[PDB]
């Protein structure tokens, strides 16, 4: 594969966005995965709706919780593959209380037709991610509260219970590392981003990687 990957550099990748109070890491996870896919499939680069996720995905738990790949199917076998856009379906759920879902009033931003679960080899995960793009992957963060910036060659590694989004890495630096987008606004890490040491599992990332996939 490729030296070094940053989809940043292709313009495939929105801004940083900001979760708040709310637990829904997972669905800006997914959405990020999908905005990035629907880009690479030949359109305009479209913000689009985590909102739709907190509210409507029923599979899921809001603000408490969720899976990537439980979105995933949500979108395709319940949402008919629709995923609307941010401006349409605003995120309101930063105090910590997610607002009941409405089914109109909304614009399609996107569509899916599935999703793939990748394989738990960040060498696997660096050869799918060159070609195909950007991954949503979960991730241990219990060390990332006190994340200023720089790359981290030490993680806490124990129990996964944050989901995020590669964009990139670069295997000729000094250390090779991982470029993860996060939720946490622009203020955290070097602009909402974070750089972990790549070959060496930190904080569990080849652990419970996918992507969406637009036909
Ligand atoms: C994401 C949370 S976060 O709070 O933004 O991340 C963050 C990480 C670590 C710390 N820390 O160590 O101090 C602080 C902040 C999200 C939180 C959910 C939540 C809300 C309140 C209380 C506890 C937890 N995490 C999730 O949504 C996980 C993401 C994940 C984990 C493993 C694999 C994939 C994705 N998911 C989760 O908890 O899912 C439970 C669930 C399963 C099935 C159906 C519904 C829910």
Redesign the pocket.
């Known amino acids: 594969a490729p030296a070094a990957v940053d989809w940043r550099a292709r313009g495939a990748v929105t801004a940083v966005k900001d ?1 708040g109070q709310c ?4 669905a800006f ?1 997914a959405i990020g995965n999908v905005e990035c896919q629907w880009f690479l499939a030949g359109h305009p680069l479209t913000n689009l709706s985590e909102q739709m996720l907190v509210s409507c995905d029923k ?3 809001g ?8 979105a995933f199917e949500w979108i395709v076998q319940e949402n008919n593959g629709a995923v609307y856009t941010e401006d349409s379906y605003p995120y309101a759920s930063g105090e910590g209380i997610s607002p009941p879902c409405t089914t109109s009033g909304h614009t399609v931003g996107a569509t899916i037709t599935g999703h793939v679960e990748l394989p738990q080899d960040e060498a696997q995960i660096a050869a799918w991610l060159a070609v195909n793009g950007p991954v949503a992957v ?1 991730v ?6 006190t994340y200023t910036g720089g790359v981290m060659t030490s993680c806490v590694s124990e129990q ?4 995020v989004l590669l964009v990139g890495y670069n295997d000729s630096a000094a250390v090779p590392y991982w470029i993860i987008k996060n ?2 606004t622009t203020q955290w890490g070097e602009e909402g981003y974070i750089r972990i040491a790549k070959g060496s599992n930190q904080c569990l990332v080849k ?2 990687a996918s992507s969406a996939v637009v036909g």
């Open positions: 979760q637990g829904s890491c997972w996870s599979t899921d738990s603000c408490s919780g969720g899976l990537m790949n439980n979960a241990d963060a219990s060390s990332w509260m996964l219970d944050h989901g939720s946490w652990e419970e």
